[PDB]
């Protein structure tokens, strides 16, 4: 519901703060660190949501595990808190006693965010907690996150690479039907002040529940986004980011032809697209003549690719203009 969604927004901003901290703090910027940061972000989301809505933590699924393997081969279960000191102890057990980085990470983890949307605050929508499942993609496009290019110029507003392609994705779906219900996308690196080097981000949200469709305020023949490895048309890194390009209208269609996207790549974006009248369809099923669902597996890959669209009319146009070859 709207309350769950507001909490999801706040903790998406917390995840954005962690992702920014690991790149703007010298000690963390020195530092498998991508896997640690991803597992950390996902566990932060899960624990915050379970603490605010008890019983929800068991329904939060994600790309990452909650176990890590340190340098010695010990498998460490990632449980944080309740105090900052225990988180420091856990992290130092993962980081070979690196006390500076452990303390910095635990500082960003336990720091709390008060980041609200006044549009969402007036909305009073209630959804039974028992029907909700959650797919988290804690840091999408980890390659662009590690590369760290701050200086890329967009083509027609579409960044082909750069920190702008990194998203945090939180998607809520109906457990019984598989339909996506709510979505949060957090872009942690949208604009960088050249003089202070500090990054500002942007959040986007959407909700489609029993015929009610709301979404965040959007800023003001066919354009198509595809991935880098994919084998008018623009290349862009990031699954969440290309979906966002469709959401914002910078591209009308996003196609992915391989089987290497997953429910956590696409759930949140699908929910926002649904709240605007669009969706995501199975590509292969379209090409032999069907929305994506998120309760049943295969294992959690979107087999047969996907098409993401904001307008059904543009989808029909593109669909049968190409199946004519
Ligand atoms: Ca991913």
Author numbering: 1 to 31, 48 to 236, 262 to 272, 284 to 341, 350 to 358, 366 to 392
Sentences from the paper on this structure:
Inositol polyphosphate 1-phosphatase (INPP1) is a prototype member of metal-dependent/lithium-inhibited phosphomonoesterase protein family defined by a conserved three-dimensional core structure. Enzymes within this family function in distinct pathways including inositide signaling, gluconeogenesis, and sulfur assimilation. INPP1 catalyzes the metal-dependent hydrolysis of the phosphomonoester bond from the 1 position phosphate of Ins(1,4)P2 or Ins(1,3,4)P3 to yield inositol 4-phosphate and inositol 3,4-bisphosphate, respectively. Conserved secondary structural elements comprise juxtaposed metal binding pockets and define a shared sequence pattern of D54…E79E80…D153PID156S157T158…D317 as shown for INPP1.
Based on our crystallographic studies, we found that the lithium-sensitive, inhibitory metal binding site was coordinated by the carboxylates of two conserved residues, D54 and E80. Residue D54 was mutated to alanine, and we kinetically examined the effect of Li+ inhibition upon the wild-type and mutant enzymes. Mutant INPP1D54A exhibited a 4300-fold inactivation relative to the wild-type enzyme with a Vmax of 13.9 nmol/min/mg compared with 59.7 μmol/min/mg for the wild-type enzyme. While a large change was observed for Vmax values, the substrate affinity appeared to be relatively unaltered with Km values of 11 μM to 31 μM for the D54A mutant and wild-type enzymes. Although the D54A mutation does not significantly alter Km, there was a large effect on Ki. As mutation of D54 results in loss of INPP1 activity without significantly changing the substrate affinity, we hypothesize that the D54A mutant can be utilized to trap the substrate in INPP1. To rule out the possibility of unanticipated conformational changes, we first determined the structure of INPP1D54A in the presence of calcium. One calcium ion at metal site 1 is found in the INPP1D54A/Ca2+ structure, alongside two sulfate ions similar to those found in Gd3+ structures.
